[PDB]
Structure formats: structure tokens, C-alpha cells
Design a protein around this motif. Structure first.
Motif, PDB file in Angstrom:
ATOM      1  N   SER G 131      23.880  60.456  14.105  1.00 51.41           N
ATOM      2  CA  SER G 131      24.193  60.571  15.524  1.00 51.41           C
ATOM      3  C   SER G 131      24.984  59.362  15.967  1.00 51.41           C
ATOM      4  CB  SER G 131      22.905  60.664  16.367  1.00 51.41           C
ATOM      5  OG  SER G 131      22.488  62.016  16.535  1.00 51.41           O
ATOM      6  N   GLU G 132      26.166  59.604  16.513  1.00 54.53           N
ATOM      7  CA  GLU G 132      26.977  58.505  16.994  1.00 54.53           C
ATOM      8  C   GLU G 132      26.319  57.905  18.238  1.00 54.53           C
ATOM      9  OE1 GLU G 132      28.254  61.666  15.918  1.00 54.53           O
ATOM     10  OE2 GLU G 132      30.391  61.533  16.426  1.00 54.53           O
ATOM     11  N   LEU G 134      25.572  56.818  22.108  1.00 54.31           N
ATOM     12  CA  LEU G 134      25.412  57.587  23.332  1.00 54.31           C
ATOM     13  C   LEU G 134      26.784  57.665  23.983  1.00 54.31           C
ATOM     14  CD1 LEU G 134      23.850  58.663  25.954  1.00 54.31           C
ATOM     15  CD2 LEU G 134      23.326  56.247  26.386  1.00 54.31           C
ATOM     16  N   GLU G 135      27.477  56.526  24.034  1.00 56.76           N
ATOM     17  CA  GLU G 135      28.807  56.479  24.643  1.00 56.76           C
ATOM     18  C   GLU G 135      29.820  57.398  23.948  1.00 56.76           C
ATOM     19  OE1 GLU G 135      27.322  53.473  23.480  1.00 56.76           O
ATOM     20  OE2 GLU G 135      26.263  53.378  25.410  1.00 56.76           O
ATOM     21  N   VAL G 137      29.220  60.186  22.071  1.00 52.57           N
ATOM     22  CA  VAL G 137      28.818  61.555  22.330  1.00 52.57           C
ATOM     23  C   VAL G 137      29.130  61.968  23.759  1.00 52.57           C
ATOM     24  CG1 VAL G 137      26.874  63.144  22.296  1.00 52.57           C
ATOM     25  CG2 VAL G 137      26.984  61.287  20.634  1.00 52.57           C
ATOM     26  N   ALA G 138      28.911  61.064  24.699  1.00 54.35           N
ATOM     27  CA  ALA G 138      29.162  61.383  26.095  1.00 54.35           C
ATOM     28  C   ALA G 138      30.644  61.578  26.404  1.00 54.35           C
ATOM     29  CB  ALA G 138      28.584  60.294  26.979  1.00 54.35           C
ATOM     30  N   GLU G 139      31.485  60.734  25.817  1.00 58.88           N
ATOM     31  CA  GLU G 139      32.923  60.798  26.055  1.00 58.88           C
ATOM     32  C   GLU G 139      33.496  62.197  25.842  1.00 58.88           C
ATOM     33  OE1 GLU G 139      36.125  58.801  27.668  1.00 58.88           O
ATOM     34  OE2 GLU G 139      33.965  58.437  27.477  1.00 58.88           O
ATOM     35  N   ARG G 140      32.918  62.916  24.884  1.00 58.63           N
ATOM     36  CA  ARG G 140      33.357  64.258  24.540  1.00 58.63           C
ATOM     37  C   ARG G 140      32.861  65.391  25.445  1.00 58.63           C
ATOM     38  NH1 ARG G 140      32.851  61.923  19.017  1.00 58.63           N
ATOM     39  NH2 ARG G 140      30.842  62.909  18.529  1.00 58.63           N
TER      40      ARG G 140
END
Lengths: 141, 141, 141, 141, 141, 141, 141, 141
Positions: G131-132, G134-135, G137-140
Motif C-alpha cells: 500500500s502506497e 495515504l497521500e 492513494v488520495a491524489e488519484r
């Protein structure tokens, strides 16, 4: 209208206590408190608290998962302050905001209907110097 | 309608006190006050305060985070003024606006339904000179 | 319907006083006043004031920041006039509009439901001469 | 329904006075008046005045600033006519419309639910001759 | 539901008078009249008049300025007929529609919820023969 | 909920009369009748008549002028049947549907909330064998 | 809020009877029944029956004609189960679901506001390992 | 407003018991409980329970079938905690959240209207160090 529409340009100066004297007619528009916060192009904005309230809504609109959105919200809201307008209708501008807007002596206030922008006379004159024509800028909207 | 719809072209002149004489029939449309502000193509616009109020709404519509939007708002609203129409139905045009619209002697007023545009007779004739055909311009809407 | 629907083609002529005689049945449709304004393809349009009022709405729709929009509004509204229909149901057509629509002697009126177009018999016949087929033009809508 | 839905194909002929005899059952649908106007593929359309009224609405929908829109409106509405259906339920078809639809002797009427199309028996048979399959044409909707 | 939902497959035959015997249970669904009209893939459709009424709405939806739309409307509606269901619940199928759907002896009726399709047993079996898998066809919706 | 939400997997068998025994708890959900119809991947679906009614709505949604839409509607609705659930809560599955879903002996029922799918134990196990991961399939929604 | 918002992380263990003990505070949120069903990344989800009801709505949203949609619905709903929470607030987890989520001994429950996810302590720790950010994953989103 | 709009920047420190002292004026805004949860850029967020409730809604909005959505929900909600604000208006920050936000000694709180962000003075100063201009970031919204 006379004092519910923020319009025009006013040349006023930064007092020795870092206060600013609203143009009288304007004082109407506001109650006894406002929210200052940093503006674009180093200008510092001024809204009636209620109006600032709405201005924020426009942002929840913007993602939140976008790094950029978070940067905006932080650069602006962590810098908004809430200031009481004194009896003479003056407003004490915070230091950080003072520094941010390069406020020295001699200010320029302009009405933007919703809000008011506070400019350092020089910085403002420069801004006006660049900036393409009204027609150019409008064509792109 | 006769004085609810700003239409036509009126040839009038700039008085020695920089005032303009509304075409009588028009005076109806307005109260005793208007908002002048700079227009597009160096023309200066004229609206009833209330109407100007609405014209602004169309802008909140436009982003705000867009540099261009901010330039527009600034070029227009920092130049709007609020002027009282005198007894004879004349309107004193501010200097800056005078200079901006290259107003000398001999003005041309045109009705744009909502508002009124004030043109320097020459500048207007030129504008009309260029400008593609009505049909050309319309095809692109 | 008989006189609430602007339809058909009427061959009438321009009177020595530059007036036009509405086709009687039409007179119904209008009150005692109309708005003439310049049309597309040099034709001059004719609407009941109220209808013209709506026709304008369609424009606020169009940008405003677009140079083209401004050219349209100016080419049309600075040329609209408001004319009273006389007792005999005639309408005095302004000079500029006369010149613009190349109105000489012998006019052709056509109904466009909402409005009425005034054509110079020749110019109209030509227009009809070019113009692709109804089917061609429709395919592109 | 029986006379509220324009359906089917009727073979009738153009009378020596250029009149057409509605198929009786149809007469119901209409009052004592209709609007004829030119149709697509040289056919001439027939609607109850009220229905024609609505058909027009669909057009205000279409731009107006588009040259094509203006050509359509002109080719159709300057050719619509309003005709009274006589006692025997016949309709006198205007000359221009007669010529336009190449109406000679022997007509074909088809129901299009909303309206009615009048075809020259030959021209119609040809039209049907070309035209791709129902399935082909439908796939593209 | 039993007779308000057009479902299933029924093997029936074309009577010597070109009539068709609705499957009893179905008779419920319809009143004493229906609209037949030509279907896709040479099948002929059958709806309660009211339902046909709605089916048409879906079309006004489609352009009208599109040549294709006009071809569809013409191929279908100029072929719809309105037929009364007789006492025994039979329906006399028009000749043209008979020929169009290659109806000989031995029909296949299928329920399509809204309407009913009439197929020539052979033509239907063939149709089913080609046609990709249900899964293939569905993937493309 | 317990009998309002079709969930889980049930291993049951096809009786010598081609009947299926609903899992008791399920019997609640249904009245005394259902609509079977062919499903995707050779499974056969089972809905309460009312629900099937809605399932159909989703289709009117789909074009109709699209060849594919017509193929779907035909492959499904000409195969739906309406079956009464007997006293013991069993359902007699039509032959064609039996053949279509390769139903032999040993069935697998799965709940799909809205409906129920009937699978041949083998065919189902295979289906599950292929099929990418839940995560893969979901990513594409 | 205390017990209407499913939040946090709870380390609990799988009992010798394959039951799970809700964190007391949580027990509030649920009644005496829930729907378990398989989750993403081998986790198993837990919702109040009503909530599960809504979760399903989000799916009817998804096509249905899409093979993928059908695979999702099947992989999830044929695996949902409905379980009663016992007096001590424990929940018996089905075998298949146990196997599917690799539940051994030592579980991790996390709140996802709407629902609850049940993880095998290890599998969860791993998941968190990859899991990458939080930032990222959120950007996408 | 004064305590309904979370604005400004406050320099406070992490107490020996890992508690944080809300800036008094702020205490108003909150009741006696809040939800902390991990924020973006290692900051930890703070909302009134009700507000957190809404913040979650924005997520149901996001797919769910998207792997990313699931990662977000998990990284945030499995880390939210619910904390009671003590008498002196202090808030005990969980360890994991402490570690996650690299909270040592010396905190920076900033108002984000809706919520509050807790930053490690250093990490925050750095964040501010990078980050493009307000104008740059805004242009992209």
C-alpha cells in the motif's frame, strides 16, 4: 447600494499602530468585525465574517484528496484572523499579514464587491503594470 | 419598454464639466444614481445600481482561483464608481474613466438592453470599421 | 392562430415615407408598437416588444467575456429601435435600418413564428438562390 | 386513438381544383383548419394548428446564431400556409407547395402520428426504393 | 401479472382469413383493439393502443432533422394499422404487414413485456440461429 | 430481512419431475408464483413477479433501435415463463430452461439479493474456477 | 457517536467455536443480527442488515449486462450470510468466510464508519506493509 | 463566528502526558469530545464528532470498488479515535497518532475552518518551505 457594494479604489495609509481606516462609506457594509486572511498576489483580503463563511464553501467544493487543495486551504485559513473594527472604523492588521502583503506606509484598497483587497501602493501599481489587457484576460474566461 | 429597454445609438457630447446628458427617454430607466465602471474595448459601461449588482453575480460564477478571474475583477471593480444623475439628467464621468475611454468631445451612447456603453465617437467608428460581419461573429456563438 | 402565428410570405412595398403595411391579419399579433432591429443576411427583424425582451435573454446566456458576444450585442441592440404601428397598421422603418437592409421599393415579409423578417425582394430571391437544400441544412442541426 | 393517431398509407388523388380529400377517419383528428408547410424530401407536411405551434418550439431550441438554423426556419415557415378544411373534408393545397412537392395527379398520404405527409405517388415510391433497411437506419439513432 | 406481462413463446398458426389467435391469457392484456405496425428483423409488433402512444414519444426524442430519423418514422408509422381484436380474441393481420413479415402458415409469438412480436416460425428459428450469445450481446449494452 | 434478502449458497437437487425445492427460509420471500427466465452464463434467474416487472424497466432504458438491445430482450423475455410454487415450496422448471441451464441432477442456488440464480453444480464450480479475483473485477466497475 | 460510528482498530481473537467478540462499545451500533459477506483483500465485512440493504443499492447502479458486474455480485452476495449476535455480543463466523479471510487465531477489526472489516492479524499487517502512502492513494481519487 | 470558524496558527506544546491544550477560544467550538484521526502530510486532524460524521459522507461518494478508495478509508478510519477533551480543555493524543505525526515537543495548530490540524513545529515549517506559491497551487484548482 452606496455602502453594500464594495467598489472603487481608495488611497489610505498604514497608521503607526498598523491600523487601517476604512473609507467611512464602507464601514457601513461591515459590522464591527471582519476576517482578514492572505490574498492572491500578496494582497490580503477583507470580508464580513458571514461572507468569509460562504467563501469557504467554495472550497469544500474542491477535492481535498488533491495535494494542491490542501496547500491552498492551509496557506489561506491558517492565516485568516478575525479582527474587530474599532470605533473610528479602523482595523488592526496582524504582523504576519502585514509582512506577507509587504505593507509599509501608503495602502490602496479596492472593492471586489464581495470582499476588499488591501494593497501596498507600489506592489499594486506594479501588478497593474504587468497584467495583459482586460480584453485579453476576459477572452480566456 | 420604451424606457425599460436600453436600445439605439445616441450622439451626444462631453460637457465642459465632464458631464454627459442622458437622452431623456433613458433617464426614465435609471433612478438618480448609476454605476459607471470601465467596459470592454475602451467604452465605459452604465447600469442601474441594482443591475450592476446582478452583473457581479455572473462573476462569482467564474473560478477565483484563476489568475485571470482575479485580473478581470480587479480591472473592472476597482474602477467602478457610483455616480448620481443630476437634475437635468446629466452624469459626471470620473477622470480616470474619462482617460480610460479616451473621452474628448463628442460621445456615442448605445443601448445594450441591460446596460449602456459610452463611446468616443471616433474610437467607436473605428471599432465598427474592423469587426467581422454580424453573421461571422454569430456563427461562433 | 390565424393571427398569433407569424407564417407565410407577403409581397408588399416600401411607401414614399419609408413605411411598411403589415398584412392586416398580422396586425392582430402586434399591439401598436414593435422593435425592429437589424437581422441576419441584411434582413431586419420585427418582434412584439415583449418577445424582443425574451430574445435578449438568449444572449445573456452567451458569455460576455467573449469578444464575439460583445460584437453581436453591439451590432444588433445599438440598432434596435422601437416603432409605433400607425392606425393603418403601417410601420415607419428607420433610415439606417433601411440602408442596412438595402430596402428600396418592393419588400418581402416572411413569418418566422416568433418574429417577422423584412427583405428586399431581390436580396431575398438571391438568398433563396444560394442556400443548400432544406435536407442538407437540416442534417447539420 | 382511431382518430388521434395519424397512421397508415392512403392512396388519394389531386382534384382539378388542387384540393385533397382527407381519408374521412382522419377528418376527426383535425378541426376545420390546418397548417400545410413544406416537408423533407419534397413531401409537404400537415398538422393541426396547435400541433404546428409545438413543432415550432423544437426550433427555438436550435441556436439561431447558426446560419443553418436560419436557413431551415426560412425554408419552412416562409412556406407554411394555414388552410381551412372544407365541408367535404378537402384541403386546397397552395400552388408553390404543389410545385414544391411535385404534386400532379395521384397522391399518397402517410400518417406520422403527429403530422401527415403528402407525397406524389411516384416520388414516394422512389424514396422507398432507396433508403437503407429499417434496421440499418435504426442502428444509427 | 399472469396477463399484464407479455412473456414467453407461443406457437400458433395463420388462419385462412389471415387472422391470428392471441393465447387467451394474453387477451387479458389487450382491450378489443391494438396497433400492429412493422417490427425489426421482419417481425411485426403488437401493442395496446395506449402503449403504442408512448412508444412514439421515444421518437420525438430522436432529432427529426436527421434523414435517418425521418426514414425510421416513415418505415414504421406509415405501416402501423389499428386492428380490432374479434370476439374469439383473434386479430386480422393486414396484407402488407403479412407480406412484410413473410407470414405464411405457422406463427411464433414472443412476449417482449411492453409489446408482442409476431414471427414466421422459420424466419424466427433462423434469427435465433445467428445472433451471438446472450453474454456477447449484453456486454455491448 | 431474513427472508427479504436473497443471500448465500444452497446445494439442492433436481427432482424426478424437474422440480426444485426452495430452501424454506426463501419461500418466505416469494408468494406462490415466480418468473424463471434464462440468466447469464447458463444460469436461469428467479424473481418475484413484481421484481421481474422492475427488472424489465431497466431495459426500456436501453435504446431499442439498437440491434443488440432487441437480441437481449428476445433471448430473455421469449424465455421467461411464470411458474407457481407448489405447496411444498417446489418449483417446476421448464424443459427449455432445463436444457439451457444444463440442469441435470444437483443444483446450486445463490442469492443475488434481488433475484435467485439456479446453477448446475458443475457449471457453477467451473464458472467460479475462471473469473478473475474479486478485486480485479471490482477495479473495473 | 460513541457507538454509532465504526472507527478504530481492535485486536481480538477467534474463539474455539469460531466466534468473534464485538468490542462492547460497538455492540451498540448493531441490533442482534448482522450480515457478514466476503470483503476485499480477504477481509470479510460486517454491516447492520439495514446498511447492507443500502450497500446493495450501489450495485444495481452498476450495469448488469457487464460480465464483471455479474462476477462481483456473485462473488459477494452468494457469500453473504446473516448472523445473529449472541448475548455476550459474539458473532459466529461461517466456515467458508473463515477460510476465505484466512482467519486463524488473532483477529483485527477496523471501523470503516459504515461497516466493519475483520482481518487476520498477519494478513492485515502485510496489507498495511505494501500500500502506497495515504497521500499517493488520495491524489488519484 | 469567533468560535465557529477554526482559523489561525497556534504555537503550543505536547505535555508530559501527551496531551494538547486547545487555545481556549477554540474550546468553544468543540463540546467535550472530538475525533482525532490521521491527516495528510503527517498532521493528524481534529473535528467535532458531528463534523467528522459529515467528512465521512464525502467518502461513500468515492467508489468503493476502487482499490485506492479502500486504502484511504482504511488508512484513515482504522486510525480515528474519539477523545474526550478534559476540564482544562486538553486532549490526550493517542500514541500511534503521536508517532504517525512525529509529535515530539512543540506543536503547531492551524485552523482549517471545518477541522483543526496538529503539526510538529518542524515538520510544518518544512512543509511550508516546499509547496509552490499560493497562486501556483490555486491556478490548478
Amino acid at each position: 447600494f452606496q455602502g453594500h457594494m464594495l467598489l472603487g479604489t481608495f488611497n489610505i495609509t498604514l497608521d503607526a499602530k498598523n491600523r487601517i481606516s476604512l473609507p467611512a462609506k464602507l464601514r457601513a457594509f461591515f459590522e464591527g468585525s471582519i476576517v482578514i486572511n492572505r490574498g492572491f498576489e500578496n494582497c490580503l483580503e477583507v470580508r464580513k465574517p458571514q461572507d468569509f463563511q460562504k467563501y469557504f464553501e467554495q472550497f469544500n467544493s474542491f477535492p481535498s484528496t488533491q495535494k494542491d487543495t490542501r496547500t491552498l486551504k492551509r496557506l489561506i485559513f491558517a492565516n485568516a484572523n478575525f479582527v474587530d473594527v474599532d470605533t473610528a472604523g479602523r482595523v488592526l492588521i496582524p504582523n504576519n499579514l502585514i509582512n506577507d502583503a509587504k505593507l509599509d506606509k501608503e495602502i490602496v484598497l479596492i472593492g471586489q464587491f464581495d470582499h476588499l483587497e488591501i494593497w501596498d501602493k507600489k506592489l499594486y501599481e506594479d501588478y497593474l503594470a504587468n497584467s495583459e489587457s482586460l480584453e485579453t484576460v476576459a477572452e480566456r474566461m
